Amino acid sequence: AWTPLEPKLITRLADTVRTKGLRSPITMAEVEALMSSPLLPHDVTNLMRVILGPAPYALWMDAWGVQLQTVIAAATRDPRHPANGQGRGERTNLNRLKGLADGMVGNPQGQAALLRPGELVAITASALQAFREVARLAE
Amino acid sequence: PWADIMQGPSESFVDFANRLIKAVEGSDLPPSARAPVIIDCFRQKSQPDIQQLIRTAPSTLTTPGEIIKYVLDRQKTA
Amino acid sequence: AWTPLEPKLITRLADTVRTKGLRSPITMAEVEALMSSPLLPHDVTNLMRVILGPAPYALWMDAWGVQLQTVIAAATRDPRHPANGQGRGERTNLNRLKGLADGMVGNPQGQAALLRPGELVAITASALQAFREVARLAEPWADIMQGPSESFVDFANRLIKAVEGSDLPPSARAPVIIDCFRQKSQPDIQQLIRTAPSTLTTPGEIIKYVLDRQKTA
Amino acid sequence: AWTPLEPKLITRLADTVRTKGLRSPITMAEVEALMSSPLLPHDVTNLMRVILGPAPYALWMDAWGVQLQTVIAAATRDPRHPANGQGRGERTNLNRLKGLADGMVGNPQGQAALLRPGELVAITASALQAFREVARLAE
Amino acid sequence: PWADIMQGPSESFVDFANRLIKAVEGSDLPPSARAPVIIDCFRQKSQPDIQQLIRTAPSTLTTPGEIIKYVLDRQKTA
Amino acid sequence: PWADIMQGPSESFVDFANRLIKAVEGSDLPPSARAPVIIDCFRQKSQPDIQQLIRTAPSTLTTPGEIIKYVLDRQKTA
Amino acid sequence: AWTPLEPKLITRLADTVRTKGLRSPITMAEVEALMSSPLLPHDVTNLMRVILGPAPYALWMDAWGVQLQTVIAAATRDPRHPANGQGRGERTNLNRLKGLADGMVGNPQGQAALLRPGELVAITASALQAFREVARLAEPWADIMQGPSESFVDFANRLIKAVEGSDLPPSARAPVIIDCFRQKSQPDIQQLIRTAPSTLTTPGEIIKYVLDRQKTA
Amino acid sequence: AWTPLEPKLITRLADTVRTKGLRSPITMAEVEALMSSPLLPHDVTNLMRVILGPAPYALWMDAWGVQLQTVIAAATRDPRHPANGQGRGERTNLNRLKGLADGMVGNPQGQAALLRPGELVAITASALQAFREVARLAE
Amino acid sequence: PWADIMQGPSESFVDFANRLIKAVEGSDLPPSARAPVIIDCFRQKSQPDIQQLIRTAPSTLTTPGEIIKYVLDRQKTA
Amino acid sequence: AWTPLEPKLITRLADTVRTKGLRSPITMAEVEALMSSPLLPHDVTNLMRVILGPAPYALWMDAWGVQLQTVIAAATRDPRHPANGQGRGERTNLNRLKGLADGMVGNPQGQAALLRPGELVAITASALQAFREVARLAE
């Protein structure tokens, strides 16, 4: 069952990003805090939509896609990925990682249903690395 | 109005991009016409130093995020 | 059946050659226009007799003979010429190309009867190349610079014209055109070509790149 | 049997391109007019040689090659191309499209003999699209 | 009259060749006698600078067109 | 002192590069820290025309020699 | 056994580079002189450290690396390189060429021990080509004319120098040199080359012909 | 074992050629001096590359080739050439004289290995005669 | 004296050749030294028009008779 | 047995050539007269030495050699030459035509001994054609 993040925490994090900036160690610590439980693509996408401005959000979408593509290359380079399965029918496509696959587009409940925990942690680590890249790039 | 937005002589590029994307997405354009307009406004606004920086791009930039990344990489630190 | 070219078109072309000259691109375009259908040796000979003066006509006869001789050398070097046949009895002699063979001298009808379409197109291409040679001869690439106000397509046209209509070998035109694009073409375009993330190895590619990334002004 | 285009029409079209330019709607209409019947590679090649300057002609050769390559990719992606046949022996190579194949180099009569009507219309549409690209690029 | 044609002191060579070929071809000579006459008139008319230029031709020129081409190549630009 | 070296308004770039490389290599830095320092001093010193010239480099320059070559190629002849 | 180059010769060469510059033919001759015996990476590296300033030395390190990489690509493209061996265990890595391999870093004696003579000559030729590149870079062929008073061998030397030390491909230098001999080289020599009963198809042949038939003055 | 010529002697000879010219008797004496021991094609080629300018070097390459061709004609006219052998398998090709044969291109050590002393002296005499021709031709 | 013979400004070439060959063959030179001397006197005497005519000979002339034939062919008729 | 031509006739012919020139029809008639009987190479050589000046004599030697070479080419193109024989041992070399062969150099008696009548008439016709060429060339 999907539970959304508190809008109070999200508002506090957005104001933190607004006053301290993207690169302060306190901001990265707060992001790591709100990045503790494995989030669904819907959660991370809406979170970055709210806390980041338009141009940093575009940059972050780009960087997140690139990092997820590196993850999928490593996944096709190793059939023992915690997102993959043993047979070929469990291979994870980027539509399933970005939340674009069938039964997931716009629906967080179905998303949480079909996604694997390894998928969730890989998406989360990818999003964190992308946030770091964009923060280092913006300023 | 999005079509009246210019990058000021002293303004940074991320502020200009923020203002432009805000005014373009919060306007009466269809959703499928925002990215091309944002790109073509990056190219024609954004005072001639960045205009020439985008013009002489050895790669083809086909997304506002890619243009922003390229300009932030190769911008004149000042 | 042979049909002559209109004397009205020929008169207009002659006046074009008289006012614009032999080398203008409009004149070459008009010649290409009147060189559209494959002409018989009689047609091309009379056409050059009318549009060209006496001395350019002598030069053109010389050049046409030389080009036809090159064609006949290539023909004896390949029995599959569209003017040739499979057996040795269809080999095409220069008397048949210049219209001097038996049953053709002075008679355009018999000419059109015995000639092949491959013969006609070879004669026509030879005459066009000879006209180009004589035009380049009747009236320097390393002195061409892009003017401060000149556009880039005009400069490229002028440079390619002067390089291809010169004494260089055919295998040395592309490198020279590239290296002249790089060193001429005033320093804005010079730096635009220098900072090319890709390697441009053809004049067409350089032209496309410069036209894409040029400073609109 | 091959019939050449009138040099009078070609001269008028060349002067139209000379005065109005490459991109005027009247020029594109005139080109569409002279692009009505399916032309052989020889015809289109000589036409572009006469009406276009040297540099636009180089650009047009490039663009025509690229568009013909896209056509040949679509042709190998569908064995029911009006240029293709049913068996593998009728597959159309770029040497046959550009007029470079055996029995065609420099000879328009043989060209018209071996070429298919689907081949002719594909070559013609490719040349028209290439002309549009070069016209949009030159100015 | 073809046999009275001289290249003037200030006249160019292409004008002289045009005038001479015109007067020789529009005359009473047989068709098979025009080329040798045109050549021998190029050699003896065409004031002594071009006369010596044609005389000292390392190759043998056997056609009016070839003589015209050679002279146009090696002529004294003035 | 290397961190006090600026390219003068009238100084050429090869003289500035010579002076900077001299002062950086003849200093107390470790050997593995000279190239990054020389690069980052080329980028932040070397008055804003060359700063923008290095910033808008379509390629990534990862060596002082490559930066010197690029700047010498695309420098404003004056 | 490794023997160092004389510091007297190195001091004289450094002062030569200081007064004459990097591109003078006397400087290149002196470098060729001190580049006679195959040098170890240590020798060439210290030599360029001493004779070149800091910025030319950085440029030269870059160019030397690039040329050595081209050499190693040719070496992996041919197992019969005089630096390579027959088996795969003798393949030469760039650490062994630049002197960075094990047992060589900072030690010229061990360097001379493990290196091959083919390795040494390849390193030396690479360093010479890199020096030429940097010299051409530190300080235009289509602007070269033969002066009214200049001899022809000086003009040919200057032209061949500027054409070979330029951005042209290697396969485009001879045609360009020929066509520049024909269009430059003031009209007396122009007519001398034009009226050549033989066809001259090489810069050396043109130079020989012109030197034979030139107007002694 | 191959030993290179001293760059000091080569520098002195280059300056001699630079000040006195190509045709002075002192210059020819110096060349004869540095032409004392039989040189490998590599040595003579680099020597002429250093002491001669570009255009005299082209002329000298031409003349050296012509003289070597005359030598090879005399060699095929007499099987008792000090460069030849008794059987047909020792016949000396121009690739072996100019240093272009297999195992010699760019490698002076292998060159010195496979070359004969008669080959070396013939190459040396040919190079000396070519130098004389070019010197008589240049001025 | 053979070494004092020059071709006069108005003298024809066959007269000059006759005079020179006469004076060279009726002199104190060895028989094996007459042809080279006659050739080298044709080249250095024989006023600069014929000098340049002999200099620009696409073929190599190695006999006085061949030089005489060539000059008589390509001489400036006047 | 060899009989020399009268020095009186030769003196009269020399004065004819001196006053009338080389190309007058009377001079050619006189030469044809003194060219009536087949002459030995010695006779024609001395005749041209006496009647012609030095430069015309050089030209005539050249032209005579060229014409004799054409004759020898025709002779090797037809084994039925009146100078040739049936076997290969009678083939006529240019040393035998120019009088340079063994037993002929400087000796007119031996010349007349070994020469054939066909050889004599061929030499004579060659000399006459060479005289015509030189006469047409001199003026």
From Swiss-Prot, chains A, D, H, J:
Location of region: Involved in capsid protein dimerization: 42-50, 103-114
Location(s) in or outside the cell: Virion
Recorded superkingdom: Viruses
Subunit structure: Homodimer. Homomultimer. Homohexamer.
Role played: Self-associates to form the irregular polyhedron core composed of hexamers and pentamers, that encapsulates the genomic RNA-nucleocapsid complex. Assembles as a tube in vitro. Binds to inositol hexakisphosphate (IP6), which allows the assembly of the polyhedral capsid.
Protein name, entry field: Capsid protein p27, alternate cleaved 1
Encoding gene, per UniProt annotation: gag
UniProtKB/Swiss-Prot annotation, chains B, E, F, I:
Source species, domain of life: Viruses
Site, Involved in capsid protein dimerization upon acidification: residue positions: 28, 40
Localization: Virion
Function, in words: Self-associates to form the irregular polyhedron core composed of hexamers and pentamers, that encapsulates the genomic RNA-nucleocapsid complex. Assembles as a tube in vitro. Binds to inositol hexakisphosphate (IP6), which allows the assembly of the polyhedral capsid.
Assembly, per entry: Homodimer. Homomultimer. Homohexamer.
UniProt-recorded name of the protein: Capsid protein p27, alternate cleaved 1
